[PDB]
Amino acid sequence: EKFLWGVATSAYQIEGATQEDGRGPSIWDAFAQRPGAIRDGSTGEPACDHYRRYEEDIALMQSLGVRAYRFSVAWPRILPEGRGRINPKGLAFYDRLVDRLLASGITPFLTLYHWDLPLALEERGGWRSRETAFAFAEYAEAVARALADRVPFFATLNEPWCSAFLGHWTGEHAPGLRNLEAALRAAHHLLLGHGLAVEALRAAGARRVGIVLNFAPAYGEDPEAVDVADRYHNRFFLDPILGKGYPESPFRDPPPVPILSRDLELVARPLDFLGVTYYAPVRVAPGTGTLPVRYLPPEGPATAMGWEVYPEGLHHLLKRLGREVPWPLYVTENGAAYPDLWTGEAVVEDPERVAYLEAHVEAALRAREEGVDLRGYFVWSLMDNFEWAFGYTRRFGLYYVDFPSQRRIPKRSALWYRERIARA
């Protein structure tokens, strides 16, 4: 069957309409109000105005020949308080979105949580509180009841490492905590929510259920430093999902984690796929504190994020996952931010982005030719959007967005992808 050539977005990053049609606030709504949290002082309002413009956006995907569209459902559009009351206008929006995708020949590839936890849940402890896992499963069930007749793929979480560690340890993401115990509680309740949601999704009819993990394959001279980095970036969530329990803690004297008996058996429920997010490797040397690794500077060209461009790392990563994971893999996000400027021309020339995608597609197809059960590849992103703590200062899109007109202008990378999908 068909390799899913796709593009990916998330709800808070693109939709806008933050306060319309009964949407409740998210942690990112409250976080973006804090001075210094977002680099340019911006928020997800209006973002790309996709809640209004999704029909034109879907025509943009169809014009490139994209066969799948990875997107998230904004929990607070569906349950404005995170639990109980349902918002029928939220569900109607995603219901209409899916019908338009199907009518365009595009496979919906739906993420349930892409970081926008309902603010009402955060007020009761968010992912630090075990109840949030159960709230998450009831949300997952409400979404599949409405959408699983037409949406084949549901991923429970997107990048729980970011939600746990950026969100609760480094403070760079919502809800902006800086506490290792909180991050470890959050990591565990994310996983538990995942496990609970898998069985709620299958009881509601979801045909393929998975999770999306990010990975940063680690390289260095000292195997012990490489191994501490590997446990933190790559094994922390994947090992529990594979039924191997947590890996040995990468942290020195970690605080306790509220693991109840049988939690890990829920976490390791059978899935249909693993989503693999990859942007860059980490290069590490022996370090010393709570997390004893020193991160080294990029060994090659880097993007506007400072992230090293190392397409062979996606190959190494897929070959490893392909031996260890007993389900098909989808590269559910891969992309690069380079400075784009539009001064009115009909195409934004982004040769460095094009170069980055071409070499990463080549690495991934090579992993597949060497035996890996890799069934799709999704570019981050369809279009420039709100990049979390970077706001609108970093652009990953195949389409440039002139935010004030909300016009979408194709980049060379959009044309490169269109031809790439047609060749394949």
Diameter over CA atoms, the chain: 60
DSSP bridge pairs for 71: 110
333 catalytic? Reply is yes
Say if strands 4-8 and 68-72 run parallel, antiparallel, or are unpaired. parallel
Reading the block at residue 380, the tokens are 């981050």
Residue closest to 44 by CA, chosen among 79, 78, 18: 18
Q: Write down the H helix ranges in 1-49.
A: 11-14, 27-31
Residue closest to 284 by CA, chosen among 236, 218, 232, 235: 218
Reading the block at residue 297, the tokens are 């500077």
According to the annotation, is 15 in a ligand binding site? no
159 catalytic? Reply is yes
Strand, coil or helix: what is 283? strand
Instruction: Work out the number of other CB atoms within 10 angstroms of the CB of residue 42.
Output: 16
According to the annotation, is 387 in a ligand binding site? yes
d(CA 218, CA 195): 27
Reading the block at residue 267, the tokens are 């976490």
Contacts of 152 (CB under 8 A, 6+ apart): 107, 108, 109, 207, 208
d(CA 215, CA 213): 7
CA of 229: how far to CAs of 292, 306, 317, in Å?
Answer: 9, 18, 14
Method of elucidation: X-ray
d(CA 278, CA 379): 10
Whether 31 and 116 have beta carbons less than 8 Å apart is answered as: no
Burial group, residue 274, by CB count within 10 angstroms (0-12, 13-18, 19+): buried
Whether 66 and 421 have beta carbons less than 8 Å apart is answered as: yes
Work out the end-to-end distance of the chain between its first and last CA atoms, rounded to an integer number of angstroms.
13
Residue closest to 393 by CA, chosen among 314, 272, 334, 305: 305
Whether 144 and 206 have beta carbons less than 8 Å apart is answered as: yes
Domains located in the chain, CATH noted = 1-424 (3.20.20.80)
Instruction: Work out the number of other CB atoms within 10 angstroms of the CB of residue 179.
Output: 14
What does the DSSP assignment read for 189-227? HHHHHHHHHHHHHHHTT-SEEEEEEE---EE-S-HHHHH
Strand, coil or helix: what is 277? strand
Per-residue burial over 206-231, b if 16 or more Cβ lie within 10 Å, else e, is bebbbbbbbbbbbbbeeeebbbbbbb
Instruction: Work out the number of other CB atoms within 10 angstroms of the CB of residue 422.
Output: 10
Whether 204 and 148 have beta carbons less than 8 Å apart is answered as: yes
What does the DSSP assignment read for 91-114? HHHHHHHHHHHHHTT-EEEEEEES
C-alpha torsion angle, residues 47, 50, 56, 62 (rounded to 10) = 100
Q: Write down the H helix ranges in 217-338.
A: 223-230, 238-241, 263-267, 311-324
C-alpha torsion angle, residues 174, 179, 183, 186 (rounded to 10) = -70
According to the annotation, is 388 in a ligand binding site? yes
Reading the block at residue 202, the tokens are 């299958």
d(CA 196, CA 191): 9
Reading the block at residue 358, the tokens are 């071409």
% helix, strand, coil for the chain, step of 5: 40, 15, 45
- Catalytic residue from among 15, 122, 159, 352: 159
d(CA 379, CA 398): 8
d(CA 394, CA 150): 34
Whether 74 and 13 have beta carbons less than 8 Å apart is answered as: no
Alpha carbons within 13 angstroms on the beta-carbon side of residue 423 total 10
Peptide bond into 175 cis (omega under 30): yes
According to the annotation, is 334 in a ligand binding site? no
Say if strands 407-410 and 399-402 run parallel, antiparallel, or are unpaired. antiparallel
- Amino acid code (one letter) for 263: D
Reading the block at residue 353, the tokens are 């982005």
- Catalytic residue from among 122, 141, 333, 352: 333
Whether 117 and 24 have beta carbons less than 8 Å apart is answered as: no
